[PDB]
Amino acid sequence: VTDPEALLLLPRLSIQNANAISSPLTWGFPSPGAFTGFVHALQRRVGISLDIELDGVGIVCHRFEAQISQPAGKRTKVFNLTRNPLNRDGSTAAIVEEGRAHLEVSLLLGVHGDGLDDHPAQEIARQVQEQAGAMRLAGGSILPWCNERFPAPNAELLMLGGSDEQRRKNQRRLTRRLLPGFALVSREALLQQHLETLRTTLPEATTLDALLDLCRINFEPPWQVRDKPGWLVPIPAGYNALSPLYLPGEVRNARDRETPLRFVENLFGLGEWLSPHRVAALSDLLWYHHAEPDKGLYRWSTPRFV
Amino acid sequence: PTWQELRQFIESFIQERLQGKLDKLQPDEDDKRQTLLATHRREAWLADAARRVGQLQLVTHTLKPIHPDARGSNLHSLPQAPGQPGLAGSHELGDRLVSDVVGNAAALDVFKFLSLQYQGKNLLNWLTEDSAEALQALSDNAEQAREWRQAFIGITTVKGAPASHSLAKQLYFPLPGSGYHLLAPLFPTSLVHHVHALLREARFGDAAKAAREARSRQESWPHGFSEYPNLAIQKFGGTKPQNISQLNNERRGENWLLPSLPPNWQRQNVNAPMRHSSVFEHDFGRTPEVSRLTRTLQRFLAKTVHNNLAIRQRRAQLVAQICDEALQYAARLRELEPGWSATPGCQLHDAEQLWLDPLRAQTDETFLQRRLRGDWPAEVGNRFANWLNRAVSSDSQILGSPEAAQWSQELSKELTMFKEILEDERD
Amino acid sequence: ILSTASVLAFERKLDPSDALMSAGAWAQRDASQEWPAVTVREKSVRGTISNRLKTKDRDPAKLDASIQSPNLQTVDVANLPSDADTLKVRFTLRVLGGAGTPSACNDAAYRDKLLQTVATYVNDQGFAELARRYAHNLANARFLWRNRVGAEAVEVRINHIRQGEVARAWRFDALAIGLRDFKADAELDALAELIASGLSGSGHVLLEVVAFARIGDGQEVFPSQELILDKGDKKGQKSKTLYSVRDAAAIHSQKIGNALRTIDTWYPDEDGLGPIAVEPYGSVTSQGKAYRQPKQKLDFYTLLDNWVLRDEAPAVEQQHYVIANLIRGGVFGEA
Amino acid sequence: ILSTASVLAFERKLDPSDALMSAGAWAQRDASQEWPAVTVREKSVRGTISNRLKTKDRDPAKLDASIQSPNLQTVDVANLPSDADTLKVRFTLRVLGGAGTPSACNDAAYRDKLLQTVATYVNDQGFAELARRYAHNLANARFLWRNRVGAEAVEVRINHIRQGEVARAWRFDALAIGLRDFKADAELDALAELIASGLSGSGHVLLEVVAFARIGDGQEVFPSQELILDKGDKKGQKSKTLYSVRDAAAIHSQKIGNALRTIDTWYPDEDGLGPIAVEPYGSVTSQGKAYRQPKQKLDFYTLLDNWVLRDEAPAVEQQHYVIANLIRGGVFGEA
Amino acid sequence: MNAIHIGPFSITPAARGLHYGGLPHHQWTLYYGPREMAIKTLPDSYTSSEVRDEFSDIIAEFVIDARHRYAPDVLE
């Protein structure tokens, strides 16, 4: 919703057991809403004391490992589980299938505020790094890099460049820092135009079918494969309204009785993983919240991408 | 139209259920037939159904897939269609909607008593309107018909207070100006059932299996097929999927999650090309991603020009991906040893070694640290361009026409970008 | 009236990393940064029927027919190399601050009462006994589990990482410190002071825990076995599967946490076992029996509602158990 | 009424390792730590028809048609080099102790009764006969299964590894010590006392056992062999796959365990065969017939349910068999 | 069970049954006359359709190789 005055690079963060089930329809890399919520929790915890705002997160995902296995005779996969403790009668409890993933991601954070002029860049960078080293990113603990060879501090780069060439060199150096990974971006325009292409191909086609067609490998008879522009993952694109926004004390057993609750349904969109050298600026990769609370639509996206 | 045919159909349904439970019980004595026909043969069974419709609930989004010791409010609501483009949901389910049933595993019979097609339509939409054939086909008295209609139509409306349990998920969302909403999500079991049905047609359908056999026979077919690789199975009910919901009893567990995976989700290893002559043609080129990219360039090089420039745009994007992977290869070459390029060897591609190992400038103070700074090696991509010249088709029709000119233009532009990327490696 | 909060959830304080397992030689433990990792391999077993028979297949003909059909499985096995008698197990522990602060709470009054109860607990005795027992369970390598059973010598090195360097190095003989006695030692008290300051603090305390076990040359190490459900599939699967991160055998973080939480020596049953893991309703998976039942007034939930709501503060041991549950975490709250 | 527990899981005492086989020469076996490992190479076999026919292909036309077009296979084969006659097999055994205590037990009172039963056994007759027979099965190289059947001379060296150093060395001629007679020898009695001290919990016993067998120059050795589910054609008709850990042939640990457990000379059938491996229902896969069937009251489960549940103590050799089963370990217990 | 005859193909099981995993198994053999092409271990709970679908990929590969091996010559 705003252009960041600076970009803070949180380095390689090893998230231990992240929620591999991103959505009721998708598994794998966690939701971008988890990353945006983590950055908002960082702004809630240490952002206010530094007189800065932390909005917008760019994910690089340097490493992914899924705690999964492939059973013999099946081409699908299953989630490795954890043994929950027994009940009070000594019996095994009912198992809820929860999957885990070891992530290694680096985050670009959009920083704007007067506190950037009040503190050194390395000071606020080290403060938000030591705050983020005791938090969670998708349900997993963050490994804060103890007793390895060379630890990685941040590099907060001011986006108000004095010259266009110096700004370009800063963005290319920051892209070179986060090199072995893929920027995950939102593709609402690509999914909508592919929906229009399928509607010209066949009418009454929903956005779900256009999302599904952009993920399966289509085999065409003369036997070739229908190509895709990018990786084109199905991402959770936010939450849509399923109920009116009830009063803060209205909903029974809410998390807090001061925040209003509204039952939601998952919104599914198309995301794309790209090499981060294929972007004009690294501020395009930032994932922003977008509530629009009168109509539900509690989305996260990448505005100012293309 | 007539109430008499609806009465005949519901009497036939309860008689079929009576003879089914008589065949299941197989009773020949102990007066079990009289007790079976004393409660499931007359209108009082409908009154007994009045004791069963209040327990069941027809829902589209439920909480019971989240931890089964949680008791929340499962609600049947169709979400509004979003005005923003390019995103899907359960709002896309229009007439292709299957409503899940939650409650006891014994009252569910009355669900088909609300899902028959007597006059040609579903009886819940028949009971949502005050029709002339309605309220007479099931009850002789008016007030009994009204209370039976209210109890039978209450299976759609949510019961109890609006509530989400502690074991359910609740996630704060930042408002634009100074606020939060708590936003408890529910499992879209109707949407999950629709996606699972579509995947069933895609993977085990008759037309899909016929297209798979046509692919196996390498013959033509009027339609294609799909594969859906890397699917994940998430069983909700451990040993009792019927306890979750009725739709989860239709598909026993098996959430069938789509692979939203990053491209580095299957990182094999990092290897150092010691005793080899060129990195692009021996080690980097054997990775499967650039393999599929090179086969894609081979397929797109020998093709018609009718969509040419648009295809060329795709081709430009395609060729960009390959040099991206080259940088990605160099990226995982940042994960190797600092001084692997200084090891002994007769041939180890020393022309590319200034870019293969950037960390040897830390190893050698002046033996090779100043060499990469003074040389500024950006011609290596030209060598890679030579390998990329092995990615083009050997067709004289492309060379005669301007297709080779456009290929050389986009190749020169993308290796200009690659050489400019390799130039400022010293910063 | 001080009703209990309907949602009440606590973060996992003392959250460990996955215990990376590597191999080497004893007296080379100082240069253990380049030790090769233990790799999980596959092997085949042909056993014979040795389970109990239910008096319908005990006839000699059917039993001989069952033996005549060969019983085969594939098992994931982790072994030491045949020139490395020492198993090194390394993980990172983050002692998080705000141990008594819940993640979620409905009632503001219940949150204030719980914070006041925890604050009185820190003002009275602190986390000093609990961090002593946590430092004990770090000091003996209980997180090695079956790797600790037949080892010649186990030694635990624990390094406090303040910013990027080892602020304080502790070295413990893990076999000398028992699995059931919680005694007093100066280095153990210093580690207890550090862990209690991390629990009482606002940030986090970072520790690197490495355990070297002299199991034997080429012996079988025991990483955590992965819980994979067969789900009634037709094709036979591998019976035993192990856990690894990247060609490197590992133990799950919850197993290391369960070994770290094995401090509960105050359950009403007899302590023939010794300490058990801090669980609500005192569940022990190795026994199939749950101590600290709610029919007695010593389960975690009734102790919390007595300590917080009705102001019936229990004994100091049960207060230690309650705060150990709060450090452990969990999802609580009636409907 | 003292019902037996649903779970009575026992750990494995006498833990073996994967016995790696290298190659070398006789009279150079003293310096054998540098010996190159036996490689599991590949070769091709042409299989002629040599099995029983099913009284349908017994016609000469179809038999000659099948013989005219035979079938080819690729086998993993492990051989000595043409200049190496001696096979060396190396593994480490770990005698743990605490054999009476089970790892998991649903019933505490049944666990106490079983502990009292094993304690009264040890007070009456400790691990003296059992450790003597285990030292016998180590002394003769029964873990050389088909590497012993035609060996010219087998020599077994057992070194007690204490603090990484050899505490005591044993050197046995494995051909003089038979595979069926359990006689007495002073060095064998010393090894029996060491395994007794290991099994009683009075000491930590790790042994390095190296067996040198004279098979011949280039002769085929017999390591452990893996199961092959699919032969196919992408894999070039792989019919036999032998076990190897890292370019080095090896025997499975459980094969060494089964060879070490061959102490049971007290089954109700005649001992003309000799000892059999200790197992519930005394099963031999090569014989295909269970000695100690559940019908004749001499198997492990009925003897354990008489000795412990109903205090019906069996004979001294039969309670030796029961305690040998407890040393072997298993998933004893009903469902 | 019994052999599955798919044209010239015969899927015949071994008479011996193994117990891979815990479930019983049988080693099913696919022959094109006297030549075997795929020996695969399959459960006894498998139906005949599943045993057919296990070897259907090798069957289709052999069919494709026979089409591309004995294709007639082309005059242009």
PDB file of C-alpha atoms in Angstrom, chain A residues 24-25 204-212 216 265 268, chain B residues 59-61 88-100 187-203 228 247-248 250-251 254-256 258:
ATOM      1  CA  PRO A  24      -7.245 -27.353   2.786  1.00  0.00           C
ATOM      2  CA  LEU A  25      -6.414 -27.989  -0.897  1.00  0.00           C
ATOM      3  CA  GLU A 204     -18.970 -21.813 -17.553  1.00  0.00           C
ATOM      4  CA  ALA A 205     -15.455 -22.637 -16.309  1.00  0.00           C
ATOM      5  CA  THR A 206     -14.758 -21.544 -12.746  1.00  0.00           C
ATOM      6  CA  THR A 207     -11.562 -19.983 -11.412  1.00  0.00           C
ATOM      7  CA  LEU A 208     -10.899 -23.258  -9.557  1.00  0.00           C
ATOM      8  CA  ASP A 209     -10.606 -25.159 -12.848  1.00  0.00           C
ATOM      9  CA  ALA A 210      -8.282 -22.503 -14.282  1.00  0.00           C
ATOM     10  CA  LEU A 211      -6.173 -22.759 -11.123  1.00  0.00           C
ATOM     11  CA  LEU A 212      -6.112 -26.560 -11.438  1.00  0.00           C
ATOM     12  CA  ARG A 216      -1.388 -30.245 -13.500  1.00  0.00           C
ATOM     13  CA  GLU A 265     -13.220 -19.741   4.032  1.00  0.00           C
ATOM     14  CA  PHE A 268      -7.004 -19.986  -3.403  1.00  0.00           C
TER      15      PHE A 268
ATOM     16  CA  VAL B  59     -23.249 -27.847   6.238  1.00  0.00           C
ATOM     17  CA  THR B  60     -20.770 -26.737   3.591  1.00  0.00           C
ATOM     18  CA  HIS B  61     -17.908 -25.789   5.948  1.00  0.00           C
ATOM     19  CA  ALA B  88     -10.949 -18.970  -6.443  1.00  0.00           C
ATOM     20  CA  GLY B  89     -12.812 -20.526  -3.533  1.00  0.00           C
ATOM     21  CA  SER B  90     -16.046 -22.211  -2.521  1.00  0.00           C
ATOM     22  CA  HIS B  91     -17.947 -19.255  -4.008  1.00  0.00           C
ATOM     23  CA  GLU B  92     -17.223 -20.816  -7.418  1.00  0.00           C
ATOM     24  CA  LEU B  93     -19.411 -23.795  -6.440  1.00  0.00           C
ATOM     25  CA  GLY B  94     -22.818 -22.911  -7.851  1.00  0.00           C
ATOM     26  CA  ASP B  95     -25.168 -25.705  -8.880  1.00  0.00           C
ATOM     27  CA  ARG B  96     -22.258 -28.172  -8.524  1.00  0.00           C
ATOM     28  CA  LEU B  97     -22.563 -28.099  -4.734  1.00  0.00           C
ATOM     29  CA  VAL B  98     -22.724 -31.139  -2.449  1.00  0.00           C
ATOM     30  CA  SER B  99     -23.772 -30.311   1.111  1.00  0.00           C
ATOM     31  CA  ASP B 100     -22.034 -32.244   3.879  1.00  0.00           C
ATOM     32  CA  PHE B 187     -12.739 -26.685   6.470  1.00  0.00           C
ATOM     33  CA  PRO B 188     -14.455 -26.342   3.040  1.00  0.00           C
ATOM     34  CA  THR B 189     -15.630 -29.945   2.819  1.00  0.00           C
ATOM     35  CA  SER B 190     -17.917 -29.177  -0.133  1.00  0.00           C
ATOM     36  CA  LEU B 191     -15.019 -27.561  -2.009  1.00  0.00           C
ATOM     37  CA  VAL B 192     -12.661 -30.377  -0.978  1.00  0.00           C
ATOM     38  CA  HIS B 193     -15.228 -32.947  -2.155  1.00  0.00           C
ATOM     39  CA  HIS B 194     -15.563 -31.115  -5.493  1.00  0.00           C
ATOM     40  CA  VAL B 195     -11.771 -30.988  -5.963  1.00  0.00           C
ATOM     41  CA  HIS B 196     -11.461 -34.660  -4.966  1.00  0.00           C
ATOM     42  CA  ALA B 197     -14.205 -35.576  -7.457  1.00  0.00           C
ATOM     43  CA  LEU B 198     -12.413 -33.647 -10.220  1.00  0.00           C
ATOM     44  CA  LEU B 199      -9.150 -35.397  -9.329  1.00  0.00           C
ATOM     45  CA  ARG B 200     -10.998 -38.740  -9.370  1.00  0.00           C
ATOM     46  CA  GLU B 201     -12.169 -38.038 -12.926  1.00  0.00           C
ATOM     47  CA  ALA B 202      -8.664 -36.856 -13.843  1.00  0.00           C
ATOM     48  CA  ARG B 203      -6.776 -39.869 -12.442  1.00  0.00           C
ATOM     49  CA  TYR B 228      -1.190 -34.718 -10.935  1.00  0.00           C
ATOM     50  CA  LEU B 247     -18.570 -36.693   2.826  1.00  0.00           C
ATOM     51  CA  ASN B 248     -15.456 -37.820   4.697  1.00  0.00           C
ATOM     52  CA  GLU B 250     -17.534 -41.069   1.049  1.00  0.00           C
ATOM     53  CA  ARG B 251     -13.799 -40.356   0.644  1.00  0.00           C
ATOM     54  CA  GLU B 254      -7.678 -38.745   1.725  1.00  0.00           C
ATOM     55  CA  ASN B 255      -7.705 -34.949   1.654  1.00  0.00           C
ATOM     56  CA  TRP B 256      -5.689 -35.053  -1.632  1.00  0.00           C
ATOM     57  CA  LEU B 258      -2.045 -30.202  -4.274  1.00  0.00           C
TER      58      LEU B 258
END
